[PDB]
Paper text:
From this sample, we simultaneously identify and solve cryo-EM structures of five different brain enzymes whose functions affect neurotransmitter recycling, iron metabolism, glycolysis, axonal development, energy homeostasis, and retinoic acid biosynthesis. Collectively, the BaR approach was then used to reveal enzyme identities and solve cryo-EM structures of these brain enzymes with resolutions ranging between 2.69 and 3.40 Å. These enzymes were identified as glutamine synthetase (GS), ferritin (FT), dihydropyrimidinase-related protein 2 (DPYSL2), glyceraldehyde 3-phosphate dehydrogenase (GAPDH), and retinaldehyde dehydrogenase 1 (ALDH1A1).
FT is an iron storage protein characterized by its unique α-helical architecture designed to uptake iron. FT is widely recognized as a critical protein for iron metabolism, particularly in the brain. It participates in providing iron availability for cellular demand and is also responsible for protecting cells against damage from iron-mediated free radicals. The BaR protocol allowed us to identify this protein as the FT enzyme. Human FT assembles as a 24-subunit oligomer, creating an overall spherical structure. Each subunit of FT presents an all α-helical structure and forms an elongated four α-helical bundle and a short C-terminal α-helix. Interestingly, mutagenesis studies indicate that the E63 and H66 residues play a key role in the process of rapid iron uptake in both the human and mouse FT enzymes.
Residue numbers in the entry:
A (entry chain D), B (entry chain Q), C (entry chain F), D (entry chain E), E (entry chain X), F (entry chain C): 6 to 177
Write the structure that this text describes.
């Protein structure tokens, strides 16, 4: 046992280890997306910048979870990061839609984790997810929904003018 | 009676009290409009900013009227602010059209008030409405008519590209 | 349903809509109070400034709640803002006492809302009320209790010297 | 009763009063430790600086708890601060080990207090302990565990070179 | 024996250890006083600030005595800090009166200590109490007597206006 | 085929895709290493900082390779990032030794890739590996060999003083 461990269930430690894997996978998906819009046949530079910064943020999220593990006396066990479930992302609209789907998946995993903490009487873990994850996620979900709405309104995916214009004004 | 009251008819005091209620209602309508364009299914950020600043201005208008009441020795009596007559505002064009309709309603109430002052020999009240309200209103009406014209020209409400583009260049 | 809605009960959405109405009413009460102390027969300038800034803060509180509604995929439904339950507020002490009463009413509505979130497993809403409302309210209640205590000590409401002196040193 | 009291159980008030006593005792223990390493026969200047700043922090923690008591309408009742349970602290390693033991004791008292708040439906108190105490404590526990690990690795307590070197590089 | 001990009687060492306990108790009394005037039913903010800074000063006095002990080769032995002899301090005037009483108690303990040094031929200890304690105490006693005089003159404790006014102009 | 593809063999494209996977794996190994030295039972803060920055660099290396793929008209295909082959890294010396082993593995993969380019007449790819990878790798290998030499000289892994001292002076 760790000399610093206090009120840290094995279930929580394990759930944290799984959260790290999911955040790392999310970063990989966004790195796939960013470079999709770097192709000469896509060329949406701002779409690429968006998913690159999202990828970096997800990595920061994983590194914060790993730090918490170490601070709670839990032991970080790492697993394989699976390949993004897609390689060709089609339009910018489909990529935003995929991103929303993945963010709502993380938020749920995070909510399930907050429930575990609430069920194991882990007030510190609760505050941590509330303080550093929950609202961030609600904020990403809303940004993506709005991106998706505007893209659909401007006529994307069929209007390439829209995706290009969306790139210059919003993502730009 | 107030020790500072001089040439202030009861009719004017009452008309001022009613003007305050209308300005407060106008602020509420614009607050409804601003948050309509904050929805994930609308996402017109600049439309939201426009109606938010309009809401703030209408509140300033009410507070100036309340100050005048106190300065003229009139007693401010407040009434219930009714709920904006709409909750779903549809397109950005419909919201601008509603805003014009409400501004022309305030200007008329203001003109009727200027008539009361002119009929009660209240030169101070007259200058006040002339100095702080009338032209402001003519200026809002013209800005809204132009917004409405450009939106209709660009193809709004049916062209979402137009509303989005209108948001980025004019409201933006 | 909203594309961004996740773990957001109808009860919570409705409770948020009601919280917005109460915050808007609180702003109206403080606007009534501010202009009460702008009368020539009252003339407590700092009392007026206090309740004006409180009014503005309550409006900011409502606008933050409306933003949260939009971010959680809830739909903002607005209701009529009732007239402040008083028009003549008597002394500065009575106004502070009314303000305390209304703040403890909001805090309770907020606490009841935090309970609903805790009962619907809404950790995000919980943090939101904890992060942006609860302590703020405890802080307002304490400022008002202290204002009320000092006013009663200095001899207010019967000592006009006290209310005037309280205005210059504390509110001033 | 206090005019500002709302949702504040007697149990919580009492638990807060006891938390204040423990934080004050912790400050006394750290003041004993700081001056232990100021002796001519010890002379670990940085060890002294560490426990002095820790002592000051614990005092700030008590003063924040006393402020919360006053803000919640609870009445601060103070008890005797017991003498630190030790006078000679031996090596720097033993002092760090004592400090860890005492920090894990405070964190537990804090966790028990968070449970009381969670059991009395005190969301404000909950956030307060989460916001200002819990993570701070997890952070102190981890800093001390690491200090203890490095000291044991470098060969302390038997190697005076280690304690001296630890003083110059880490505490220094 | 300490390698640095020279002309340091056991009586002096013990008297220094007792002086430390009294200074620590004085700090506790002032911390009780400071938070008394932070209550919603008292609300004398400047009275609170006064006794808080006094509390901090008394702690500095104890820490200087502990440093001297270490420098003279004496060994610091710590005892329990008793609870302030009061919990409710009534008026600001009574608190000042209590503070004077406690300061004259410390000065006497300090004078008795200076006598011990003069009787044991400890010129260094003599200068230390003369240099860092005696005049400071005479200066605190005079500030408190003057505070007490002005409070009694302005009509305190019965005039709450006085205590409030005293807070804004002198303590303020 | 891509409209920008010219002198880009399928073998090279595939070798680039494999290089990306290896660089991503290297980043994962360094992230495992960094957090190993963040444990309370390890606590080598500078060792953690070293492997964290190395992890970031390897990610930059992968992202540069992905950019080159897009610029040469090759299509990025991503595969699963395997879990670092170790979870407990033992001493700081073993971690450096592992890092050397992995860097010499990447350099070889890079050299094999430079051979493929030289064999397919791809002068651009050749310069790219020469310009951005080869020397960097020779420079990392030498830094790690030197780190390993100094650690072994100072007595690590058995001397914890050495690892701690190595952390403060070199990594520090
Ligand atoms: Fe994330
Ligand atoms: Fe207006
Ligand atoms: Fe509010
Ligand atoms: Fe503490
Ligand atoms: Fe003193
Ligand atoms: Fe690399």
């Amino acid at each position: 046992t760790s000399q610093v461990r206090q009120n840290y269930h094995q279930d929580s430690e394990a759930a944290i280890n799984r959260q790290i894997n999911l955040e790392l996978y999310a970063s990989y998906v966004y790195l796939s997306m960013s470079y999709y819009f770097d192709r000469d046949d896509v060329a949406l530079k701002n779409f690429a910048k968006y998913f690159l910064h999202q990828s970096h943020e997800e990595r920061e999220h994983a590194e914060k979870l790993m730090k918490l593990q170490n601070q709670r006396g839990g032991r970080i066990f790492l697993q394989d990061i699976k390949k993004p479930d897609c390689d060709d992302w089609e339009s910018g609209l489909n990529a935003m839609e995929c991103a929303l789907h993945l963010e709502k998946n993380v938020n749920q995993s995070l909510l399930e984790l907050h429930k575990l903490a609430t069920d194991k009487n882990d007030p510190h873990l609760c505050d941590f997810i509330e303080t550093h994850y929950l609202n961030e996620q609600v904020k990403a979900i809303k940004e993506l929904g709005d991106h998706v709405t505007n893209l659909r309104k401007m006529g994307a995916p069929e209007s390439g003018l829209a995706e290009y214009l969306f790139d210059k004004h919003t993502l730009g």
